[PDB]
Design a protein around this ligand. Sequence first.
Ligand code: ZN
Ligand code: ZN
Ligand code: ZN
Ligand code: ZN
Ligand code: ZN
Ligand code: ZN
Lengths: 281, 281, 281, 281, 281, 281
Amino acid sequence: GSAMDVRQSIHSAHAKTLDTQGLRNEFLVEKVFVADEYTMVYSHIDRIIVGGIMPITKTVSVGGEVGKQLGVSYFLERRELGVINIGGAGTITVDGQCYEIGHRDALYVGKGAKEVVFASIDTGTPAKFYYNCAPAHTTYPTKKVTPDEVSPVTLGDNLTSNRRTINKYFVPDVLETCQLSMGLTELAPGNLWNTMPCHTHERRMEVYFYFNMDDDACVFHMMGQPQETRHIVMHNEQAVISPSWSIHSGVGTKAYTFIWGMVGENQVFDDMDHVAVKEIC
Amino acid sequence: GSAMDVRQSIHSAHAKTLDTQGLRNEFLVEKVFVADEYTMVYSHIDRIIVGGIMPITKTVSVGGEVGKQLGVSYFLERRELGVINIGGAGTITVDGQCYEIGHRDALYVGKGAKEVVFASIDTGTPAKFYYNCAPAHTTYPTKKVTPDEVSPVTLGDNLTSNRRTINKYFVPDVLETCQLSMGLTELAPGNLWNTMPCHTHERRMEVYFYFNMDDDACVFHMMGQPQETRHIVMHNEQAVISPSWSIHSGVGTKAYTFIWGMVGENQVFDDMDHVAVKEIC
Amino acid sequence: GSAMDVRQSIHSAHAKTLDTQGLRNEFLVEKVFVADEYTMVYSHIDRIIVGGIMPITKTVSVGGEVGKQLGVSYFLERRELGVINIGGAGTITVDGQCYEIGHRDALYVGKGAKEVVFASIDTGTPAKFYYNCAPAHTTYPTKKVTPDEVSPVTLGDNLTSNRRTINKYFVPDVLETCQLSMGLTELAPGNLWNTMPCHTHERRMEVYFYFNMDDDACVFHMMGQPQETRHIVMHNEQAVISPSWSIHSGVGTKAYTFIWGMVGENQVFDDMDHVAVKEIC
Amino acid sequence: GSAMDVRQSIHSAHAKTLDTQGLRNEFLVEKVFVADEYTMVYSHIDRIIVGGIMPITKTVSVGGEVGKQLGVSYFLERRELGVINIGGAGTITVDGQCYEIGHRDALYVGKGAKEVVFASIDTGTPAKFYYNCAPAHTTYPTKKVTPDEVSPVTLGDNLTSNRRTINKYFVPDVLETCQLSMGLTELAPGNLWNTMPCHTHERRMEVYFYFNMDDDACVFHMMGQPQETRHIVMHNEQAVISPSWSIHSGVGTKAYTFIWGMVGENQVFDDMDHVAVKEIC
Amino acid sequence: GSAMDVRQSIHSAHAKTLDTQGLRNEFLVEKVFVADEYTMVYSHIDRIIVGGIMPITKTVSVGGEVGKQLGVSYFLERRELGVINIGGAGTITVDGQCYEIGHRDALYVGKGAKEVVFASIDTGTPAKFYYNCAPAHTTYPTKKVTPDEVSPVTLGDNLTSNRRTINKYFVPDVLETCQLSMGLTELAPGNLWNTMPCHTHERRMEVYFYFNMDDDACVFHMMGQPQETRHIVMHNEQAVISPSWSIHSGVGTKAYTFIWGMVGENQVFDDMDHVAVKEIC
Amino acid sequence: GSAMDVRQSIHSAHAKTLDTQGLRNEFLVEKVFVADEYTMVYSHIDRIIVGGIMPITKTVSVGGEVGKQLGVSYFLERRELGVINIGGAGTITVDGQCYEIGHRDALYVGKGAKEVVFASIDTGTPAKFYYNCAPAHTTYPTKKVTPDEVSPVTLGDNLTSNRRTINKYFVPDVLETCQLSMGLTELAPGNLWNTMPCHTHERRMEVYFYFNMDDDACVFHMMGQPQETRHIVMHNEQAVISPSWSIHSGVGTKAYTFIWGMVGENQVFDDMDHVAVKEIC
Ligand SMILES: [Zn+2]
Ligand SMILES: [Zn+2]
Ligand SMILES: [Zn+2]
Ligand SMILES: [Zn+2]
Ligand SMILES: [Zn+2]
Ligand SMILES: [Zn+2]
């Protein structure tokens, strides 16, 4: 069926020997949005599935076929889905129930949903549905989350180039999920740093997706163990997978927006090892 | 805090470069049963936790402290436990509820159980509780499983040295679990091969535990991708971790018994890639 | 002239870094029997030459041409030859003297024989002459050895899966040779292990040839230093070269038969380092 | 003799295999200013010598002894020196001629000067003389360069986090030198990027020195071939050597100031390969 | 424009891992003389440029175009040139001034010369102009040097196979140059060794060019650190680049002649580390 | 038991990765003559044993104990010995039979000799017995070989620095041996090259022993495949082992003498691959 980009899990000792292209081949997802298609990358790190869906002349659906590829009857038979629309207004129909998902609206689809259909309202400005999918043992209600219900928080300062607005869509304070959490953080114009100071967490893993970047800009995404850092240079609408032993911080050449997705054996966000940047240098 | 042996996940390209000791350091658990203590190995491959508990002069408990090591309040706050006793009669008390677990009896403890205490009835023939623990999002009832509740099946033939009795303890036909399944297979005297022909399954992983072996015997456990196989020579009461891209088949120098534990994103046991041994050679 | 597959000698430190294919390229002889042809593999480990001859529509001979390839006048000008027929009845003619070599009959040809011609009696069930050839400084009588003159010995036990019958064809008790010894060992149905416990011998080297195996079976041939073992998966009618620092033991998925050939600076079979399997694990 | 830290030249194929510590060992100068001493690093890349001098309780001189270490009679017998004071007011006496070098004043010492003595006016706020020294075949006049003699130019913008003031001290428009050029660039508060977009120049090499940074800040200095970039995390008052095949661009966690030094076979600053950041990603 | 063979600088730790071809690719210049063309090899080790010019049917000139390749207006705008003719009589015209350069005559061209034109008097026995070019900050007079003005010295002894005649063309005793020195040494018939005992010099580098060798002869050129020597097998009219950490000595299979060129930060020829051959063995 | 220096056989792909010390560890025998002792090196390349014996205050014998180390009853039970005395007059007693072996006299001891005792006539000028020992299947008569029994041949020329006198002691024209041949070649003063042009022979191997060299001299012994040559720098009285795939040619810094020993499956000295030195370069 549809092509499935599979990434293996990786040992820190192996990762530290990878050259530039080697790092990209393992951790970088270069193509997230493809017209009238959905992309799908399967990571053996917590078995999270990441991708993008951009419906233009036709709808794009996931269900039976994808499920068979996963050894089950349908895609979400034993999985939960988190979707955030960074493009134009669209709709997501779950087993017949249509949800209007506008710019920056989001939708969490619980375990048990048989078919999910994505569509764009205007072909001129198509919806760009970014998603993260994780194994789920229990069914929680499918829920639409708007920027309102999120209650954004602006932190940082120009001097530390981290003035930004944090929007947490899928977290305990908003709704119940099995293990998936997602949020969107927008750096203010002229501000470049995200996740600083950095951190690592043995019991959870994160995937970052960068977007809303000018064609001539990029983000130097920092990864690796604190004392053995490496970087991947990324451009607009690309995602990066972070092993549990790795940090995940980035600095752009211009301001940008990014989405973070996190899974693991717990949802204790303070269960992490904070790393002061001075320790790195 | 109690020592926690942590094993990282590993890429097939990395594993194929490991020498004999390297393979042992990564995949082999050399000591499972330690008097009056519990052993615990954490594998980043599906975050399964495995070990053994052998109470002799005192009971051994797991609960609050172990939970703190996992960033939670107690061991099973977000996990399920599967235990099989291969030693003498003992008991397992879950939050005050005492279960009599004799030789070859087993106990599944669901998510939410706060403290589990293991004990042996006779210090001369201590219980040997082998356990596998996996993340769980749903709470299923704690349940004792005995041999007469399991439907034993004899398969194989002497000519193929695989005459054996299969005993599936934690499987869909017996009880509901989130992702864990476990069983015990005993080879008839003079029969050496397990999991032959072999297989691999991208969506699940298994851990094998070998026991009931003479002091002068061993098992050559075959692992690796089908076309890049390797082996680890193991002795009595040792376990081996198998990545999803790896096979897991062993041949002893004498008959033996082993327990398999499996976790992953589905419990579709037929969702695998069968590998005819003739393909390997 | 005829193609000659040459294998170099190898250092233990080099061998331990070889991957699956690397091990096969160095030590495995994949094609031993080819219709109306003879195969010839030259190993710089004691300069032993191994191969197979399967005459069907024509006879196959070795003599002048092969000798020139070795820098001499004829193949056995400074070499001795040991041949064992594992196929249908045939004949081996040495400088005009015809020897009837039936199934499991053997022939030792001493230094000085100028031409050796191999033939099959029935094209439907051709002779399969397996041979080992070694440098020889003195001429010993050409001698036909039948399964009678061998006096077989049955050892082992089903429990250790090594019940087998040992047939030593070319050994001091049967005839005089310069340095070559050969024998045939047949495992009883349902028995899998050969050369266990294993051993190594600095002053001699062995070559194993596996046959009489079902098309769906294989043998996991164990090699390498005792504490750094590796394996080569082999199928019907394939041979494997063992360096002096390496062990040579194998376990099949079904019973099989194999021939061993040994050369070196002495024929003291007890001059070896025995290795208890428990030492390996 | 005074300790001389010697760095070899390096091939791009070699540099791309270096791990974090390896990169630091080769290209990073971790200690530049040491009380009452001078530091000295010799790079086989164009044989440039770099270091710092911080006189506190006594003067620090360079002359005869250093010359002997270079196989000549005195330090500047065949070399030219460029010094920039980033500390408190001080003086530099060249063969008896005393020059008052205040904060941000600089001094170029031409070939032929026998002894140079560095001093600080106030021990409470010692002068911090950063210097770059290169081979010189011609004698140009020793010359003091002050800020009002330099033509400061403000470039960049907050949106691209590169708002900065460029101060070129030793350049063709100011004075004549054999091959050395040096300048000081100060990023405005909240601006982090230097040398963006980046470049490479086969015929020249540069050394960057970062300072005026808070104790809790650092600079991720980007290096390497454009398609094989690496980074070195540096802290206050540390320098980095850049091979001709490498880029040199840094981004801080906070604003900072840095000095660049450049040598080579020409002083054609436009003789370089411009690299658009979009090419890297 | 004209092809430019660029060689990077190299670290001793990198060089010691290079195989035979790797050493040749880095240090050997296989083609020095090409009919009606000039060859040009640029080494990042002191930025010396080496090559050969053999005019036959047309003159060969260097000037504007080559200069542009170096980022300047003309080849010698910031460089000095040393040329030695090992072929038939020719002429070298510098900015209109014609110099007659016969067999073994030489010409030093100082910084500032805009165009240099090479020509041969007889096409049957063309001039073979070998040159070395180095960065130069000051202009010294262009000067023709004949074998007379050189005052040759014959040293060595047949017993040590180093009987030879040394001819130093460009050295302080003959003329002033910025950093370049060159000479020609001819081994007597039957004498094979050059530069023995060997040496190294951190502050200078040398390039050796071997010629006047029979078609069936070669020179085993020894290089590398004294305790980690390697060799490059060379034939008639080939040059070899030597890093500052490397020795440069050679032994032929027959007598030969060679030219040495040296550049660096000083012209103190006794500033070196002598190495007794007994130290090497 | 007496120390036995054992060298493994080696693959060309392995040998080409060895650094200077690695090559020495594998192929070089640094100490051959030790006062009142015998040295012994065992090479798995044809199982040749080499060493030296220098009796000063007492005799040195080889027999029973050494045999036990080889798994036999006595040293020469299945081996032949070739000895050449390069020191002062001495004697060699074989099972009671005393042979007077003066300077440059030699002795071949055939298979079956039980004990060999070496002695020196004058302690002031001790005998220096260099020996090569190889497996032997046939018993040939023990025989003393003197210079006047050898047919010396002078070859080479000063122009090719290979003027030398060849003395073949153990060869077909002198006596019968199983596989061993040995000779002594002395270069005339001022001549440095041996075995030039070089060669390789798949069916035989050689060991070279250099001596009569001044304390300030050495020999650059060339080895390796023709297109992947390496060298080992040796001093007085040191030996070097050459794999069948390797060349063996040396060039001294002064004249010297050397002994070659050769074994293999044939004694056809013309059965080799001639390599023109021009092929190497
Ligand atoms: Zn994180
Ligand atoms: Zn499995
Ligand atoms: Zn054996
Ligand atoms: Zn630059
Ligand atoms: Zn030199
Ligand atoms: Zn040879």
